[PDB]
Amino acid sequence: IEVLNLVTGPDSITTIELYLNTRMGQNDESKDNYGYSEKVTVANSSDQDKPTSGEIPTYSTARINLPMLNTLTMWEAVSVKTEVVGVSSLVNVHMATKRMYDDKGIGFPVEGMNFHMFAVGGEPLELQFLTGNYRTDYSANDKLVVPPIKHQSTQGLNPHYKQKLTKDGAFPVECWCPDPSKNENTRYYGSYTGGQSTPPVLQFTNTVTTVLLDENGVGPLCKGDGLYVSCCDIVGFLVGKDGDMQYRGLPRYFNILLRKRTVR
Amino acid sequence: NIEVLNLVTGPDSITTIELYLNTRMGQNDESKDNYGYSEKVTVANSSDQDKPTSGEIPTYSTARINLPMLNEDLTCNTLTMWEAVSVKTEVVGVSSLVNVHMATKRMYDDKGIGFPVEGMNFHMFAVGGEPLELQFLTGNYRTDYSANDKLVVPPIKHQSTQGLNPHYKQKLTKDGAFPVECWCPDPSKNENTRYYGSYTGGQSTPPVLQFTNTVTTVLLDENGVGPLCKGDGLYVSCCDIVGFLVGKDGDMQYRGLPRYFNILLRKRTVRN
Amino acid sequence: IEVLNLVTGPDSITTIELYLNTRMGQNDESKDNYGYSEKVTVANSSDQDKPTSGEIPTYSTARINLPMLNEDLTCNTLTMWEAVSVKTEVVGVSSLVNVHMATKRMYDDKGIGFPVEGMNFHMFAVGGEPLELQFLTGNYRTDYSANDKLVVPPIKHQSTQGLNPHYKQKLTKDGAFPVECWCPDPSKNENTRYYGSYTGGQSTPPVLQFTNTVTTVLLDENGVGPLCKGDGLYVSCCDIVGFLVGKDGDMQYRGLPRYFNILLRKRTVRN
Amino acid sequence: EVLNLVTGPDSITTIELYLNTRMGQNDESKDNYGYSEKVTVANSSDQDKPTSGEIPTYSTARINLPMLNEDLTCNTLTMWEAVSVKTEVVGVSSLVNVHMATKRMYDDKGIGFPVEGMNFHMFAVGGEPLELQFLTGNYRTDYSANDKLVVPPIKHQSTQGLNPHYKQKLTKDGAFPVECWCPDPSKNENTRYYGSYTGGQSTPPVLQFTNTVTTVLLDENGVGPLCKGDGLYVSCCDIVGFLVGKDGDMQYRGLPRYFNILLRKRTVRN
Amino acid sequence: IEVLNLVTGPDSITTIELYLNTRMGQNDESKDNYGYSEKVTVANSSDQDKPTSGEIPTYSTARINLPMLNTLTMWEAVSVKTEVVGVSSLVNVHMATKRMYDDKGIGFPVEGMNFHMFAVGGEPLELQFLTGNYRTDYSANDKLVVPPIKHQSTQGLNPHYKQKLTKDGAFPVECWCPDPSKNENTRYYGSYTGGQSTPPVLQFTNTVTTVLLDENGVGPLCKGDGLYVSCCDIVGFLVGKDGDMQYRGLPRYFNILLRKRTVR
Numbered sequence A, E: 001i002e003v004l005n006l007v008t009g010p011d012s013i014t015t016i017e018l019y020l021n022t023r024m025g026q027n028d029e030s031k032d033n034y035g036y037s038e039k040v041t042v043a044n045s046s047d048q049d050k051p052t053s054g055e056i057p058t059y060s061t062a063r064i065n066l067p068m069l070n071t072l073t074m075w076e077a078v079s080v081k082t083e084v085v086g087v088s089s090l091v092n093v094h095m096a097t098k099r100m101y102d103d104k105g106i107g108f109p110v111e112g113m114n115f116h117m118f119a120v121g122g123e124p125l126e127l128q129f130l131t132g133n134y135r136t137d138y139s140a141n142d143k144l145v146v147p148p149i150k151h152q153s154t155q156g157l158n159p160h161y162k163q164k165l166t167k168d169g170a171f172p173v174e175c176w177c178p179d180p181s182k183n184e185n186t187r188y189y190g191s192y193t194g195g196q197s198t199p200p201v202l203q204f205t206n207t208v209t210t211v212l213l214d215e216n217g218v219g220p221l222c223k224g225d226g227l228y229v230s231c232c233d234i235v236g237f238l239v240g241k242d243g244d245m246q247y248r249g250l251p252r253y254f255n256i257l258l259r260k261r262t263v264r
Numbered sequence B: 001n002i003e004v005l006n007l008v009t010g011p012d013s014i015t016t017i018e019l020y021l022n023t024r025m026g027q028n029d030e031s032k033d034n035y036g037y038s039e040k041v042t043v044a045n046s047s048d049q050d051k052p053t054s055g056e057i058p059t060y061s062t063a064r065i066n067l068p069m070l071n072e073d074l075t076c077n078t079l080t081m082w083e084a085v086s087v088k089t090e091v092v093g094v095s096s097l098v099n100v101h102m103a104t105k106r107m108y109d110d111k112g113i114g115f116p117v118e119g120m121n122f123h124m125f126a127v128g129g130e131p132l133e134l135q136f137l138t139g140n141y142r143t144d145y146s147a148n149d150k151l152v153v154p155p156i157k158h159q160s161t162q163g164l165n166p167h168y169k170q171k172l173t174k175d176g177a178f179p180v181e182c183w184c185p186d187p188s189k190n191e192n193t194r195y196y197g198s199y200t201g202g203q204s205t206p207p208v209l210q211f212t213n214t215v216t217t218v219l220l221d222e223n224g225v226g227p228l229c230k231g232d233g234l235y236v237s238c239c240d241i242v243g244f245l246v247g248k249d250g251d252m253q254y255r256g257l258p259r260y261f262n263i264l265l266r267k268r269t270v271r272n
Numbered sequence C: 001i002e003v004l005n006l007v008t009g010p011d012s013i014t015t016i017e018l019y020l021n022t023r024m025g026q027n028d029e030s031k032d033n034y035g036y037s038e039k040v041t042v043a044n045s046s047d048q049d050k051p052t053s054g055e056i057p058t059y060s061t062a063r064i065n066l067p068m069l070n071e072d073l074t075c076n077t078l079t080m081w082e083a084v085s086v087k088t089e090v091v092g093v094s095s096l097v098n099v100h101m102a103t104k105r106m107y108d109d110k111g112i113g114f115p116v117e118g119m120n121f122h123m124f125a126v127g128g129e130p131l132e133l134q135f136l137t138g139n140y141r142t143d144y145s146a147n148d149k150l151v152v153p154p155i156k157h158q159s160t161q162g163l164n165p166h167y168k169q170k171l172t173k174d175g176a177f178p179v180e181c182w183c184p185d186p187s188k189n190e191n192t193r194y195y196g197s198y199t200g201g202q203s204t205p206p207v208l209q210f211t212n213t214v215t216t217v218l219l220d221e222n223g224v225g226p227l228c229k230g231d232g233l234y235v236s237c238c239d240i241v242g243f244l245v246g247k248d249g250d251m252q253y254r255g256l257p258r259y260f261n262i263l264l265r266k267r268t269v270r271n
Numbered sequence D: 001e002v003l004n005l006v007t008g009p010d011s012i013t014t015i016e017l018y019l020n021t022r023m024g025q026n027d028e029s030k031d032n033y034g035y036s037e038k039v040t041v042a043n044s045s046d047q048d049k050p051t052s053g054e055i056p057t058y059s060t061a062r063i064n065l066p067m068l069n070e071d072l073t074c075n076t077l078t079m080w081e082a083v084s085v086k087t088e089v090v091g092v093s094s095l096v097n098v099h100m101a102t103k104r105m106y107d108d109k110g111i112g113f114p115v116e117g118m119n120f121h122m123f124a125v126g127g128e129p130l131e132l133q134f135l136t137g138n139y140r141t142d143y144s145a146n147d148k149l150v151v152p153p154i155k156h157q158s159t160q161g162l163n164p165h166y167k168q169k170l171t172k173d174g175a176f177p178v179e180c181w182c183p184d185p186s187k188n189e190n191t192r193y194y195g196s197y198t199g200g201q202s203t204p205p206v207l208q209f210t211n212t213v214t215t216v217l218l219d220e221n222g223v224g225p226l227c228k229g230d231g232l233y234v235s236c237c238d239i240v241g242f243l244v245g246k247d248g249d250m251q252y253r254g255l256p257r258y259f260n261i262l263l264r265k266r267t268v269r270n
């Protein structure tokens, strides 16, 4: 796309506000364990690694239809204000959990692994397959989107194994990451803090704007008047009384500012 | 909805408001033992029977401060409003955590220090021209709050509240009443409030705290406009959990600290 | 104080250099255990919480007299010293690189001695008058009467576990005001700048820096530093770097000294 | 001695690549790719002989740049100058996996141990091979279980510090060992390198990924790496921790790294 | 020194490159255990605290002769690029050490206390004595430089106990620190991260320049055309099979830029 001048004047800006609920594994808001995974199970061996249905976190994603337009004009994403919602819900140590100090102390708070990422773009987020175990069998849940073939080389980067993030709550985070060789029209940001019982470290404010313009002063350009938003926000595990553990995720809010851009 | 006009200049066009808010950890009566702590934490028998005892639940601190009355005639073409420009805020009493002789569990086979207050930290404050707007979100939709009918929670529960369900909202209008565990700032609203928060979890995590009288937080938005104080009210809210006190037998209580605010405001003309 | 212009020209600047030794509880430089507290003891209950003499860290403080400025008091203005900036450092950080002292040790009596570790508390203040204090304690019933030299309120009340503004003081004596129950009063201290940090936990790694290259600006938002009333400069601090763990598990606070180099300038004010 | 930038058509070029990790099992057609073989421990310092495949090595490639004239009799010549790089660790999200066949938490009821522990991350971009200094924790380490590793032919006590007689160039992928070769700070004037180490036993990995960060390769004088012989040299290592097997056996885990490098033509004196 | 203007023209700049090997206790490069301390021992009581020979880290230092000059002209140190060398050597978990998970897991990596300092000056680093134990007896090693008299007050700052860092591998870190009341003509930078088994956190790059100019734009001025460089870099302890522990140190590289300065 050949990018020309900005369109000036009264109707040249618009904003899109949305939230995405977490996709930790039980993703139906009417059913038990919503906002958590099902209980984590552990493979007996690498060739018998078959996660149960609902124990696998997946990416949240939405495509938002933008106001009608129409050299052509496209919406250009300029900036985003994004927040993790419900951080204070983690201030809860009276749930039915394992507890400290010979059954007398606090319940374990949600703790452990944190994974936080978001992406804003003008087309679907482009994905690269990469897994800790090439033999992982996802057949317990046919709604997951994974490659049809398995190969040893996918424990590294094999560029024959790619996808696009086109469906909410379906692409496992454990085997799909952003493709850094593409995504020219998307901006993504992510972080991982691992370990077993690591303290979650989280912030929330309504005062931070993230600029989405690239080094040339150009934001994501919304092809077919679609804005694509994606994320995942794992805040740790809930540890049940018997030691069974579930992923816990939180929703993410977005407020995206867009402007009209003339293109050739 | 408020159309903002020009700043009123000259002398007397600025004012400052100073206050502190004491912590609301659960034992919130300053005349009783255990003030500034929660009651001992208990743990649910099951997720269906999750009923916190009265006073074991931290809540937000909040106040509405009356500002100097600007308008004798409320039917004038324009009016003057107080606009919050900046705030200096600090947690008070951080040095009180340098205490390891209290009646607590202790290190090294009963020969070492008492356990200092440690574990989960949660710090937030908000300054606005109207009450802080809240979104309900909980780790357990079934939590039963009926042991304390002074708490403000939604009148019905549903599975979906373990995520973001925008049908469950509120406004922070009462001190010591809205549980932190189920109410958070609503990011889809709060156009006229600025809020800042952090959480550091884990079981016995070291508290990491700072205090100074030299830091100013700017409250002006992207357009150079601060919170506008509707009806000459300034709304300040916070929560500062610094960890748990571990008693001799392992029983634990939240510990909170007060927060101080020094807010600078200026007169702004607005359309009436 | 109505602050007017800076005084220019020769001798319009001066510097003050000092250090303050730590006041961890054993505060006599001629005695063993200097720079440490006495052994920490622990209350059996909150109504029998009575620290032993010397187990309680207190603030260090000094007043430094500055060159006199105002012989004439009948004129429209006066001159005050204004503290512009300070270079401050904790001294002796390298002394913590010591794992052969008589301490508990790692790995079934084969490994290193425990280094000094655990709680860190670091604060300093520079002002033109004594640091103003607010009382706040983790236990309102703490009985300080084993050491009557500690400056504490004469009465106890439940409300002092939060902020009760009827319980205030000024830091007017070195090695006497417990850090555990006195903090800076944020509603005052207009003429002081203070900076503090706390890192808690049981055996937490101390994280410490030392350099002679950092200047802290003491000017406020209006460009005005602390103004030294009666030509007095007040400097206060506390620097706890953790606990020494003895062989049997007995523990003592360890503190370090703090160095200060303060730049001051002459400022005209209204009389 | 650099002169001015060349201007005009085809005076800019870009190089895009990735490097797969070299943790020890470096064959993409076999099981356990991107991990080391099981770690073993020496009985004593004089019999410290790592097994074949348990030792991470640097990843490296030389990339051909568009060919320029190299006549040694010319007054000036053109060279490619590397200006900036965008680089990211790939597959960080793969660490969100606690159902692998691993030791597990809470009396065999909790999560599998995630990959955790030591992190080592470094990359380099230069106009010649990365210059290496030998330095080891044990001068007597015996590398003879794998003769494909590049190590010095003689061992000496001084190599537990910096002995400048023990140097190399990073000229082969998967060969190299990280444990005994580091970037030489006394050379590498024509390379930029960046590295970090976080140690400990079960330390949480802390990792970030984004496509929004550009690393400037220009030095204090405004000059980037100059590509001798029209070669661009890219090197890295990204260890993200250990996988802990059911019986406590442990393997290094590494991740690939992506690079996008911008270059421009620079006139130099000859 | 009254500082005047910079000298301009050819040969007004020079650079000095060097490295300093660590002085952890076994400081002979021909012997086993070079770059480590001897095994750490622990006093039975504070009045019988007598470290063994070689278990005590000391500062590394050097004086470098600069090109001869000669108002007078002096060399002024402007900036330094400095790096800890051999960080990657800590990626080694097969040494003869204690190991994880019931003798099946990795050897313990070098871990625990980190201490990092360097100084660049135009005269010797000025030191202040301060110790955790005034009674420490250094007589097992007569090559160490320590005060001849012991006193209780030396557990705080006693300004009657000072020295200058004039000998490599002789001044113990545990009782000598930079004197903040002097060192006007030196820049020093240090950090300590303590604890028992703390993860070392270390960086290495050839892209960072440390500016040595003070608030007045003046760097260290090299008296008698001597440049003084000092450091210590403790990266943790090596834990032997039986639990015996030794300090591990790493060398430090310096590239210092100097310029000619006119002085009165």
Ligand SMILES: CC(=O)N[C@H]1[C@H]([C@H](O)[C@H](O)CO)O[C@@](OC[C@H]2O[C@@H](O)[C@H](O)[C@@H](O)[C@H]2O)(C(=O)O)C[C@@H]1O
Residues within 6 Å of the ligand: B101, C040, C041, C042, C043, C044, C048, C049, C050, C051, C052
């Ligand atoms: C903070 C506090 O109250 N300290 C007490 C201390 C502690 O109660 C105890 O040492 C635990 O660390 O006890 C002190 O008295 C010790 C003394 O107490 C009597 O009750 C008992 O009969 C004696 O045998 C002996 O235990 C102490 O000095 O340690 C007093 C101190 O106030």
Ligand SMILES: CC(=O)N[C@H]1[C@H]([C@H](O)[C@H](O)CO)O[C@@](O)(C(=O)O)C[C@@H]1O
Residues within 6 Å of the ligand: A094, A095, B041, B042, B043, B044, B045, B049, B050, B051, B052, B053
């Ligand atoms: C969170 C919760 O449900 N708390 C309940 C507790 C705990 O189940 C136990 O004390 C175990 O800690 O038991 C009570 O009888 C009590 O102590 O008053 C009722 C209370 O509602």
Ligand SMILES: CC(=O)N[C@H]1[C@H]([C@H](O)[C@H](O)CO)O[C@@](O)(C(=O)O)C[C@@H]1O
Residues within 6 Å of the ligand: D039, D040, D041, D042, D043, D047, D048, D049, D050, D051, E094, E095
């Ligand atoms: C670093 C080292 O020397 N490893 C050696 C190991 C270990 O001593 C044991 O496996 C204990 O882990 O023993 C070997 O027989 C082996 O496993 O093949 C030889 C190998 O050289």
Ligand SMILES: CC(=O)N[C@H]1[C@H]([C@H](O)[C@H](O)CO)O[C@@](O)(C(=O)O)C[C@@H]1O
Residues within 6 Å of the ligand: C100, C101, E040, E041, E042, E043, E044, E048, E049, E050, E051, E052
């Ligand atoms: C710091 C100290 O005083 N070390 C002393 C040690 C220790 O008391 C024990 O070894 C316990 O580690 O005992 C010695 O006999 C020794 O080992 O050579 C003498 C030495 O002076």
